[PDB]
Design a protein around this ligand. Structure first.
Ligand SMILES: NCCc1c[nH]c2ccc(O)cc12
Length: 145
């Protein structure tokens, strides 16, 4: 039960400085970022221990928000990619691949929702509403973003 907060508190100071880029889903390369994104993808329960994207953790959640045959396709593609990289880089390649796909748009909603559900900031059945968007913005503002 390590949280996304636990992971950010742990960042090394070259990245702590760039927290707001990170939390904007902006892509930063490196083995620093490789380890942090493994930490967060595990905290949000999106990847296996070795960093492989879990299809079944994302498929239904993505489709509930945006019903789209493309989630299947993008999940299969991005899981395929992450398997072919080393385990240090795997979760981060999965994450990066998804954000670049047409699934990115909905992935960020699912990611935001899970982050705040796990933080106990919104109820477990919370949907992606205008209120939620404001809750996320205020949450980031408290972190200086
Ligand atoms: N609310 C999304 C925050 C967020 C998006 N991508 C991230 C990557 C790492 C992290 O600690 C946080 C994030």
């Amino acid at each position: 039960m390590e949280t996304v907060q636990d992971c950010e508190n742990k960042l090394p100071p070259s990245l702590k400085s760039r927290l707001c880029e990170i939390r904007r889903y902006e892509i930063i390369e490196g083995p620093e970022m490789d380890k942090h994104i493994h930490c967060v993808m595990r905290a949000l329960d999106f990847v296996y221990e070795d960093g492989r994207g879990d299809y079944h953790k994302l498929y239904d959640p993505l489709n509930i928000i945006e019903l789209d045959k493309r989630h299947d396709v993008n999940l299969e593609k991005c899981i395929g990619e992450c398997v072919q990289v080393p385990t240090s880089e795997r979760a981060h390649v999965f994450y990066k691949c998804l954000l670049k796909s047409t699934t990115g748009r909905t992935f960020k909603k699912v990611f935001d929702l899970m982050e705040l559900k796990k933080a106990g900031k919104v109820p477990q059945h919370q949907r992606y509403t205008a209120e939620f968007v404001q809750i996320m913005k205020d949450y980031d503002k408290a972190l200086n973003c």
